[PDB]
Amino acid sequence: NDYCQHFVDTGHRPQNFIRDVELIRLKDELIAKSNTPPMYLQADIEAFDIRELTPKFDVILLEPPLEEYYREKCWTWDDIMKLEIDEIAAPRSFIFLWCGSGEGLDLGRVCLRKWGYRRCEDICWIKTNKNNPGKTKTLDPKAVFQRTKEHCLMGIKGTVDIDLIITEEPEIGNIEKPVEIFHIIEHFCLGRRRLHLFGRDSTIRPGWLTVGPTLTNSNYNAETYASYFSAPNSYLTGCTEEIERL
Amino acid sequence: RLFPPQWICCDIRYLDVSILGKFAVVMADPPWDIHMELPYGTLTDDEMRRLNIPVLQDDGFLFLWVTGRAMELGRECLNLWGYERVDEIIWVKTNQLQRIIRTGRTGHWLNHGKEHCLVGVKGNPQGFNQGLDCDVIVAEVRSTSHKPDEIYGMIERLSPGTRKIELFGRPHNVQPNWITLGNQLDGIHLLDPDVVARFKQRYPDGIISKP
Ligand SMILES: COc1cncc(-c2cn([C@H](C)n3ccc(N4CCC[C@@H](NCC5CCC5)C4)cc3=O)nn2)c1
């Protein structure tokens, strides 16, 4: 009955017991047909001037490498808050910020507001430990509870899915977030200009521009990129038919 | 200790909570002003800010349920009242077969699978059992608008035998070691002698009026 008690008794997290961890496919197909070719750029985001990334984005996914992701160089909230995200967001646009499980849940909201967004969803990545019951970690010293989830805050500026992702906890030092976040974002049909900051070779994806320090290669060209969104395709949502040409 | 259930039927805006003493844990489930017409009475942002939460504890923990824009307002209140937020519990709402209950609300982008409870700390809490529980609750949606009973067990393992206070609690919430406040409770049931004395002298005619 009481899965909290059960966790205390056995080390199996309550979420281990959630079961089941249309033409939603037709729509996945339209996303795939709409998607720009994958574009990517190796850039030191601290040293690099963000305004070089054009045009202005419909969606920004921001995944700064927090020290908390590495238990057994990282960005602090000081560093993140000083990013010039409002300089590259479209007047109507969305952001998804991975905030971790600690002070990020507060500081990430200050960030969103600083950049001109309002927080409109809180997506939790709940991590199961089905293959590794018990086997716990050193609490951040302010922690009261074992932290078994991560939050991705969604923000909107200007004017299908559930807010949970459940997967098994990744092996130690594996920093990746669930690819399901992309499925959630793309299903909102928000526009085709999609930026992933602090992406990696492993996250590069059709329909996205990926920018990050560890990229081994680049293909980014601002003019070529801008040409994917020129008329008559300026206002596509990314969930509708390509416009016929000759 | 295991002090039996106590409660006070009141308007929480008007009760002088200084008569209750100090608690290791405060929990609140406020009827936040979620900018919307609702069938129940809400508290304005100002009334929430003005609640005299700071008198209820010197050292300990606050559990504050939040939803919608109260995710932000609740953080403001928490800070305003002298707490730092150090954890966030989510309750994943299921049915009797452990399937997520998924409700959608207009003006929202996503279906919601969970409720959030902020955890704040004030002062120098000592002798708490940190890290026994984890920060996800998976439990059955019973009555509409109720919280899961699991939270009480988590709090008791965290802080066994200490005095606790719940604000905006329902009758089914009353419990040993807790004093429960809310306006749907049935009169007043107080057993702690210290509280009984202070209440008699503050409220000799038993009446808890707009001050
Ligand atoms: C108005 O002035 C008041 C002044 N003084 C006291 C009250 C008051 C009110 N109440 C009742 C029991 N009460 C409680 C909560 C509530 N809300 C909104 C509905 C949803 C609740 N949160 C559900 C989440 C938590 C996990 C799921 C919170 C609505 C409500 O009526 N007792 N005392 C009101």
Coordinates of C-alpha atoms and ligand atoms in Angstrom, one line a residue:
Chain A
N1 CA 0.0 0.0 0.0
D2 CA 2.5 2.7 1.2
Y3 CA 5.3 2.8 -1.3
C4 CA 7.2 5.4 0.8
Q5 CA 7.4 2.9 3.7
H6 CA 8.3 0.3 1.1
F7 CA 11.2 2.3 0.0
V8 CA 12.5 2.7 3.5
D9 CA 12.1 -1.1 3.9
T10 CA 13.6 -2.3 0.6
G11 CA 15.4 0.6 -1.2
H12 CA 13.0 0.3 -4.2
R13 CA 11.8 3.8 -5.1
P14 CA 8.0 4.3 -5.3
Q15 CA 8.3 5.2 -9.0
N16 CA 9.6 1.7 -9.7
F17 CA 5.9 0.6 -9.2
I18 CA 4.3 3.0 -11.7
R19 CA 2.9 0.7 -14.4
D20 CA 3.2 1.6 -18.1
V21 CA 6.2 3.8 -17.5
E22 CA -3.6 7.3 -32.1
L23 CA -2.4 9.1 -35.2
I24 CA 0.2 10.7 -32.9
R25 CA 2.3 8.8 -35.5
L26 CA 1.0 10.8 -38.5
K27 CA 2.1 13.9 -36.5
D28 CA 5.5 12.3 -35.8
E29 CA 5.7 11.9 -39.5
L30 CA 4.8 15.5 -40.3
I31 CA 7.4 16.6 -37.7
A32 CA 10.0 14.4 -39.5
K33 CA 9.1 15.8 -42.9
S34 CA 9.1 19.4 -41.7
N35 CA 12.5 19.0 -39.8
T36 CA 15.4 21.0 -41.1
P37 CA 18.7 19.0 -41.6
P38 CA 20.6 18.7 -38.3
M39 CA 22.9 21.6 -37.8
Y40 CA 25.6 21.9 -35.2
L41 CA 28.5 24.1 -34.0
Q42 CA 31.4 23.6 -31.6
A43 CA 31.5 26.8 -29.5
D44 CA 32.8 27.8 -26.1
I45 CA 29.6 29.3 -24.9
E46 CA 31.4 31.4 -22.2
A47 CA 33.9 33.0 -24.8
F48 CA 31.5 32.9 -27.7
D49 CA 29.2 35.8 -28.5
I50 CA 25.6 34.4 -28.5
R51 CA 24.3 36.9 -31.0
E52 CA 26.2 35.2 -33.8
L53 CA 23.4 32.5 -33.6
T54 CA 20.7 33.7 -36.0
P55 CA 17.9 33.8 -36.8
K56 CA 16.0 34.3 -33.5
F57 CA 14.7 31.0 -32.1
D58 CA 11.2 29.6 -31.6
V59 CA 12.5 27.1 -29.0
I60 CA 15.6 27.0 -26.9
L61 CA 16.7 23.9 -24.9
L62 CA 19.3 24.8 -22.4
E63 CA 21.3 22.1 -20.7
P64 CA 24.2 23.7 -18.8
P65 CA 26.5 21.1 -17.2
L66 CA 25.8 21.6 -13.4
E67 CA 28.3 20.3 -10.9
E68 CA 25.5 18.2 -9.3
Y69 CA 25.4 16.0 -12.5
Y70 CA 29.0 15.0 -11.6
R71 CA 29.2 13.3 -8.3
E72 CA 31.5 10.2 -8.5
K73 CA 34.3 22.5 -16.5
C74 CA 30.9 22.9 -14.9
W75 CA 28.6 25.9 -15.1
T76 CA 27.3 27.6 -11.9
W77 CA 24.0 29.4 -11.7
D78 CA 26.1 32.7 -11.7
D79 CA 27.5 31.7 -15.1
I80 CA 24.1 30.6 -16.4
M81 CA 22.2 33.6 -15.2
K82 CA 24.7 35.9 -17.2
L83 CA 24.0 34.2 -20.5
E84 CA 22.3 36.6 -23.0
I85 CA 19.4 34.4 -23.9
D86 CA 16.9 37.3 -24.5
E87 CA 19.3 38.4 -27.3
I88 CA 18.5 35.3 -29.4
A89 CA 14.9 34.3 -28.5
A90 CA 12.1 35.3 -30.8
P91 CA 9.6 37.8 -29.3
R92 CA 7.2 34.8 -29.2
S93 CA 9.3 31.8 -28.1
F94 CA 9.7 29.0 -25.5
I95 CA 12.6 27.8 -23.4
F96 CA 13.2 24.5 -21.6
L97 CA 15.8 24.7 -18.9
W98 CA 17.2 21.6 -17.2
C99 CA 17.6 22.8 -13.6
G100 CA 18.7 19.7 -11.7
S101 CA 17.3 18.9 -8.2
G102 CA 18.8 21.5 -5.9
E103 CA 19.1 25.3 -5.9
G104 CA 18.5 25.2 -9.7
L105 CA 14.7 24.9 -9.0
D106 CA 14.9 28.4 -7.6
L107 CA 17.7 30.0 -9.6
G108 CA 16.4 28.6 -12.9
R109 CA 13.1 30.4 -12.3
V110 CA 15.1 33.7 -11.7
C111 CA 16.8 33.0 -15.0
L112 CA 13.6 32.5 -17.0
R113 CA 12.2 35.7 -15.6
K114 CA 15.5 37.6 -16.2
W115 CA 15.3 36.5 -19.9
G116 CA 11.7 37.7 -20.2
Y117 CA 9.9 34.4 -19.8
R118 CA 7.2 33.2 -17.4
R119 CA 7.4 29.6 -16.2
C120 CA 4.4 27.7 -17.5
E121 CA 5.2 24.0 -17.0
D122 CA 7.5 22.0 -14.7
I123 CA 8.5 18.7 -16.3
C124 CA 9.9 16.1 -13.9
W125 CA 12.3 13.4 -15.0
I126 CA 11.6 10.7 -12.4
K127 CA 14.3 8.1 -12.1
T128 CA 13.6 4.5 -11.2
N129 CA 16.2 2.2 -9.5
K130 CA 14.7 -1.2 -10.5
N131 CA 18.1 -2.6 -11.4
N132 CA 19.9 -1.2 -8.4
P133 CA 17.7 -1.0 -5.2
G134 CA 19.2 0.8 -2.2
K135 CA 22.7 1.9 -3.2
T136 CA 22.1 5.5 -2.4
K137 CA 24.2 8.8 -2.6
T138 CA 25.6 11.4 -0.3
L139 CA 22.9 14.0 0.2
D140 CA 23.7 17.6 -0.7
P141 CA 24.1 18.6 3.0
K142 CA 20.9 20.7 2.8
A143 CA 18.8 17.8 1.4
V144 CA 16.1 16.4 3.7
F145 CA 15.1 13.6 1.2
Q146 CA 16.9 11.4 -1.3
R147 CA 16.7 13.2 -4.6
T148 CA 15.4 10.9 -7.3
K149 CA 14.2 13.3 -10.0
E150 CA 15.4 16.3 -12.2
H151 CA 13.3 19.2 -13.3
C152 CA 13.1 20.8 -16.8
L153 CA 11.3 24.2 -16.6
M154 CA 9.3 25.4 -19.5
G155 CA 9.0 29.2 -20.1
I156 CA 7.0 31.2 -22.6
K157 CA 7.4 34.8 -23.8
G158 CA 5.1 36.8 -26.0
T159 CA 1.5 35.6 -26.5
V160 CA -1.0 15.5 -26.0
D161 CA 1.9 14.9 -23.4
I162 CA 2.1 14.7 -19.6
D163 CA 4.7 16.6 -17.5
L164 CA 6.6 13.5 -16.4
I165 CA 9.3 11.4 -17.9
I166 CA 10.1 8.1 -16.2
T167 CA 13.3 6.2 -17.0
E168 CA 15.9 4.1 -15.1
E169 CA 18.6 6.1 -13.4
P170 CA 21.6 6.2 -15.8
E171 CA 25.0 4.8 -14.7
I172 CA 27.2 7.1 -12.7
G173 CA 28.9 9.9 -14.6
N174 CA 26.4 9.5 -17.5
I175 CA 25.1 13.0 -17.9
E176 CA 22.5 12.5 -20.6
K177 CA 18.9 13.6 -20.2
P178 CA 16.1 11.5 -21.6
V179 CA 15.5 11.9 -25.4
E180 CA 11.8 12.0 -24.5
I181 CA 12.3 15.7 -23.7
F182 CA 12.7 16.3 -27.5
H183 CA 9.5 14.4 -28.2
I184 CA 7.6 16.6 -25.7
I185 CA 9.1 19.8 -27.2
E186 CA 8.5 18.8 -30.9
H187 CA 4.9 17.7 -30.2
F188 CA 4.0 21.2 -29.0
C189 CA 4.4 22.4 -32.7
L190 CA 6.0 25.7 -31.6
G191 CA 8.1 26.5 -34.7
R192 CA 11.0 25.2 -36.6
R193 CA 13.9 27.3 -35.3
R194 CA 15.1 25.1 -32.5
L195 CA 18.3 25.6 -30.5
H196 CA 20.0 23.3 -28.1
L197 CA 22.6 24.9 -26.0
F198 CA 25.2 22.7 -24.4
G199 CA 24.2 19.8 -26.7
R200 CA 26.8 17.2 -27.6
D201 CA 27.7 14.9 -30.6
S202 CA 25.3 12.4 -29.0
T203 CA 22.3 14.8 -28.9
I204 CA 22.4 16.1 -32.5
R205 CA 19.1 15.6 -34.0
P206 CA 17.1 16.6 -37.2
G207 CA 15.1 19.8 -36.7
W208 CA 17.7 21.2 -34.3
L209 CA 20.7 23.4 -34.2
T210 CA 23.1 22.0 -31.5
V211 CA 25.8 24.3 -30.0
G212 CA 28.2 23.1 -27.4
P213 CA 31.9 23.0 -26.4
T214 CA 32.5 19.3 -26.8
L215 CA 31.2 19.0 -30.4
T216 CA 33.9 17.4 -32.6
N217 CA 32.6 18.9 -35.8
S218 CA 30.6 21.8 -37.1
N219 CA 28.5 22.4 -40.2
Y220 CA 26.8 25.6 -39.0
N221 CA 26.4 28.5 -41.5
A222 CA 24.1 31.3 -40.5
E223 CA 23.0 32.1 -44.0
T224 CA 22.3 28.5 -44.9
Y225 CA 20.4 28.1 -41.7
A226 CA 18.3 31.2 -42.2
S227 CA 17.4 30.0 -45.7
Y228 CA 15.5 27.0 -44.2
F229 CA 13.0 29.5 -42.7
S230 CA 12.7 32.0 -45.6
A231 CA 9.3 32.5 -47.3
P232 CA 7.0 30.8 -47.9
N233 CA 8.0 28.7 -44.8
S234 CA 8.6 31.5 -42.2
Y235 CA 5.7 30.7 -39.9
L236 CA 5.4 26.9 -40.1
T237 CA 4.7 25.2 -36.8
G238 CA 6.7 22.1 -37.8
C239 CA 3.6 19.9 -37.6
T240 CA 2.1 20.6 -41.0
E241 CA 2.7 19.6 -44.7
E242 CA 5.7 21.1 -46.5
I243 CA 4.5 23.8 -48.9
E244 CA 4.6 22.7 -52.6
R245 CA 7.4 24.3 -54.8
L246 CA 8.4 23.7 -58.4
Chain B
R1 CA 6.0 11.0 22.5
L2 CA 2.5 10.3 21.0
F3 CA 0.2 13.2 21.9
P4 CA -3.4 12.5 20.6
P5 CA -5.0 14.5 17.8
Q6 CA -5.9 18.2 18.5
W7 CA -7.6 20.8 16.3
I8 CA -9.1 24.2 16.1
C9 CA -11.9 25.2 13.8
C10 CA -11.0 28.7 12.7
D11 CA -10.3 31.3 10.0
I12 CA -6.6 30.9 9.8
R13 CA -6.3 34.6 8.9
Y14 CA -7.7 35.7 12.3
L15 CA -6.4 33.1 14.8
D16 CA -3.6 34.3 17.1
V17 CA -1.2 31.4 16.5
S18 CA 1.2 32.6 19.2
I19 CA -0.9 30.6 21.7
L20 CA 0.1 27.3 20.0
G21 CA 3.9 27.3 20.8
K22 CA 6.6 26.0 18.5
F23 CA 6.6 23.1 16.2
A24 CA 9.3 20.9 14.5
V25 CA 7.2 20.8 11.3
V26 CA 4.6 23.0 9.8
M27 CA 2.5 21.8 6.8
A28 CA 0.2 24.0 4.8
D29 CA -2.2 23.3 1.9
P30 CA -3.5 26.8 1.2
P31 CA -6.4 27.6 -1.1
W32 CA -4.2 29.8 -3.3
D33 CA -5.7 32.5 -5.5
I34 CA -5.2 30.7 -8.7
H35 CA -6.4 33.6 -10.9
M36 CA -9.8 31.9 -11.6
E37 CA -13.3 31.5 -10.3
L38 CA -13.4 28.6 -7.9
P39 CA -16.2 26.9 -5.8
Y40 CA -14.2 27.5 -2.5
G41 CA -12.9 30.6 -0.8
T42 CA -9.3 31.6 -1.6
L43 CA -6.8 33.8 0.2
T44 CA -5.3 36.7 -1.6
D45 CA -1.6 36.9 -2.2
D46 CA -1.4 39.5 0.5
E47 CA -3.3 37.4 3.1
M48 CA -0.9 34.5 2.4
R49 CA 2.1 36.8 2.8
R50 CA 0.6 38.1 6.1
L51 CA 0.0 34.7 7.7
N52 CA 2.0 34.6 10.9
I53 CA 4.0 31.5 10.0
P54 CA 7.2 32.9 11.5
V55 CA 5.9 32.6 15.1
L56 CA 5.2 28.9 14.7
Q57 CA 8.9 27.6 14.6
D58 CA 12.4 28.5 15.6
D59 CA 14.1 25.5 14.1
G60 CA 12.5 23.1 11.7
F61 CA 10.8 22.3 8.4
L62 CA 7.9 23.7 6.4
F63 CA 5.9 21.6 3.9
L64 CA 4.0 23.9 1.5
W65 CA 1.8 22.5 -1.2
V66 CA 1.9 24.6 -4.4
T67 CA 0.3 24.5 -7.9
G68 CA 0.1 26.8 -10.9
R69 CA 1.4 30.3 -10.2
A70 CA 1.7 29.4 -6.5
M71 CA 4.8 27.5 -7.5
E72 CA 6.3 31.0 -7.6
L73 CA 4.1 32.7 -5.0
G74 CA 4.7 29.8 -2.6
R75 CA 8.5 30.3 -3.0
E76 CA 8.0 34.1 -2.3
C77 CA 6.0 33.3 0.9
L78 CA 8.5 30.6 2.0
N79 CA 11.4 33.2 1.7
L80 CA 9.3 36.0 3.2
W81 CA 8.5 33.8 6.2
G82 CA 12.2 33.1 6.9
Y83 CA 12.7 29.7 5.2
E84 CA 15.2 28.5 2.6
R85 CA 13.7 25.9 0.2
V86 CA 15.9 22.7 0.4
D87 CA 13.7 20.0 -1.2
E88 CA 10.7 19.6 -3.5
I89 CA 8.4 16.5 -3.1
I90 CA 6.2 15.5 -6.0
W91 CA 3.2 13.3 -5.7
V92 CA 2.5 11.1 -8.8
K93 CA -1.2 10.6 -8.7
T94 CA -2.3 7.0 -9.7
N95 CA -5.4 4.9 -9.7
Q96 CA -5.9 1.6 -7.8
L97 CA -3.8 -0.1 -10.6
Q98 CA -0.8 2.3 -10.3
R99 CA -1.6 4.0 -13.6
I100 CA -1.0 7.8 -13.6
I101 CA -4.1 9.9 -13.4
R102 CA -3.7 12.5 -16.1
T103 CA -5.8 15.7 -16.1
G104 CA -5.7 18.6 -18.5
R105 CA -6.6 22.2 -17.8
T106 CA -7.2 24.9 -20.5
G107 CA -4.4 27.5 -21.0
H108 CA -1.9 24.7 -20.2
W109 CA 0.5 23.1 -22.5
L110 CA 0.8 19.7 -20.8
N111 CA -1.4 17.3 -18.9
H112 CA -0.4 17.2 -15.2
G113 CA 0.6 14.0 -13.5
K114 CA 1.7 15.4 -10.2
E115 CA 1.4 17.8 -7.3
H116 CA 4.3 19.6 -5.8
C117 CA 5.2 20.3 -2.1
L118 CA 8.0 22.7 -1.3
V119 CA 10.2 21.8 1.6
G120 CA 11.7 24.7 3.6
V121 CA 14.0 24.9 6.5
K122 CA 14.4 27.6 9.2
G123 CA 17.0 27.8 11.9
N124 CA 19.2 24.9 13.2
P125 CA 17.1 21.7 13.0
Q126 CA 19.0 19.0 14.8
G127 CA 18.2 15.3 15.3
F128 CA 16.2 14.9 12.1
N129 CA 16.5 11.7 10.0
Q130 CA 17.4 13.2 6.7
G131 CA 17.5 10.9 3.7
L132 CA 15.2 8.0 4.9
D133 CA 12.6 8.8 2.3
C134 CA 12.9 9.9 -1.2
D135 CA 11.3 12.9 -2.9
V136 CA 8.7 11.1 -5.1
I137 CA 5.4 9.9 -3.7
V138 CA 3.3 7.4 -5.7
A139 CA -0.2 7.1 -4.3
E140 CA -3.9 6.8 -5.1
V141 CA -6.1 9.8 -5.7
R142 CA -8.8 9.2 -3.1
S143 CA -11.3 12.1 -2.6
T144 CA -10.9 15.1 -4.8
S145 CA -8.5 17.8 -3.5
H146 CA -7.1 15.6 -0.7
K147 CA -3.4 15.1 -0.1
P148 CA -1.9 11.5 0.2
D149 CA -1.6 10.2 3.7
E150 CA 1.9 9.0 2.8
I151 CA 3.2 12.6 3.6
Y152 CA 2.4 12.1 7.3
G153 CA 4.5 8.9 7.5
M154 CA 7.4 10.7 5.7
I155 CA 7.3 13.5 8.2
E156 CA 7.1 11.2 11.2
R157 CA 10.1 9.3 10.0
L158 CA 11.9 12.6 9.5
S159 CA 11.0 14.0 12.9
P160 CA 9.5 11.2 15.2
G161 CA 7.6 12.2 18.3
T162 CA 7.9 16.0 17.8
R163 CA 4.9 18.5 17.8
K164 CA 3.6 19.4 14.4
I165 CA 1.0 21.8 13.0
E166 CA -1.1 21.6 9.9
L167 CA -2.8 24.6 8.3
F168 CA -5.9 24.3 6.0
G169 CA -6.3 20.7 7.1
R170 CA -9.5 18.7 6.8
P171 CA -11.1 16.5 9.6
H172 CA -9.7 13.3 8.1
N173 CA -6.2 14.8 8.6
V174 CA -6.2 15.0 12.3
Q175 CA -3.5 12.8 13.9
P176 CA -1.3 12.1 16.9
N177 CA 1.5 14.7 17.4
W178 CA -0.4 17.1 15.1
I179 CA -2.6 20.1 15.8
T180 CA -4.8 20.7 12.8
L181 CA -6.3 24.1 11.8
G182 CA -9.0 24.8 9.3
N183 CA -12.5 26.1 8.9
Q184 CA -14.2 22.7 8.2
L185 CA -13.1 21.2 11.5
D186 CA -15.6 20.5 14.3
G187 CA -15.2 23.0 17.1
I188 CA -12.0 22.9 19.2
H189 CA -10.2 19.9 20.7
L190 CA -7.1 20.8 22.8
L191 CA -5.3 18.6 25.3
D192 CA -1.8 20.0 25.6
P193 CA -2.0 21.9 29.0
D194 CA 0.3 24.7 27.9
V195 CA -1.9 25.3 24.8
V196 CA -5.0 25.0 26.9
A197 CA -3.9 27.7 29.4
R198 CA -2.7 30.1 26.7
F199 CA -5.9 29.6 24.7
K200 CA -8.2 30.2 27.8
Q201 CA -6.3 33.5 28.6
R202 CA -6.2 34.7 24.9
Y203 CA -9.8 33.6 24.2
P204 CA -11.7 33.5 27.6
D205 CA -15.1 33.4 25.9
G206 CA -14.0 30.8 23.4
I207 CA -14.5 33.1 20.4
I208 CA -12.0 33.6 17.6
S209 CA -13.1 36.9 16.0
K210 CA -11.7 39.2 13.3
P211 CA -9.1 40.9 15.5
Ligands
LIG1 C1 -10.4 31.1 2.5 O1 -10.1 31.4 3.9 C2 -9.8 30.3 4.7 C3 -9.4 30.7 6.0 N1 -9.1 29.8 6.9 C4 -9.2 28.5 6.6 C5 -9.6 28.1 5.3 C6 -9.7 26.6 5.1 C7 -10.0 26.0 3.9 N2 -10.0 24.7 4.2 C8 -10.2 23.5 3.3 C9 -10.0 22.2 4.0 N3 -9.4 23.7 2.1 C10 -8.1 23.3 2.1 C11 -7.4 23.4 1.0 C12 -7.9 23.9 -0.2 N4 -7.2 24.0 -1.3 C13 -7.7 24.4 -2.6 C14 -8.2 23.1 -3.3 C15 -7.0 22.2 -3.5 C16 -6.1 22.1 -2.2 N5 -4.7 21.5 -2.5 C17 -4.8 20.1 -2.9 C18 -3.3 19.7 -3.2 C19 -2.5 19.3 -2.0 C20 -2.0 18.1 -2.7 C21 -3.2 18.2 -3.7 C22 -5.9 23.4 -1.5 C23 -9.3 24.3 -0.2 C24 -10.1 24.2 1.0 O2 -11.3 24.6 1.0 N6 -9.7 24.5 5.5 N7 -9.5 25.7 6.0 C25 -9.9 29.0 4.4

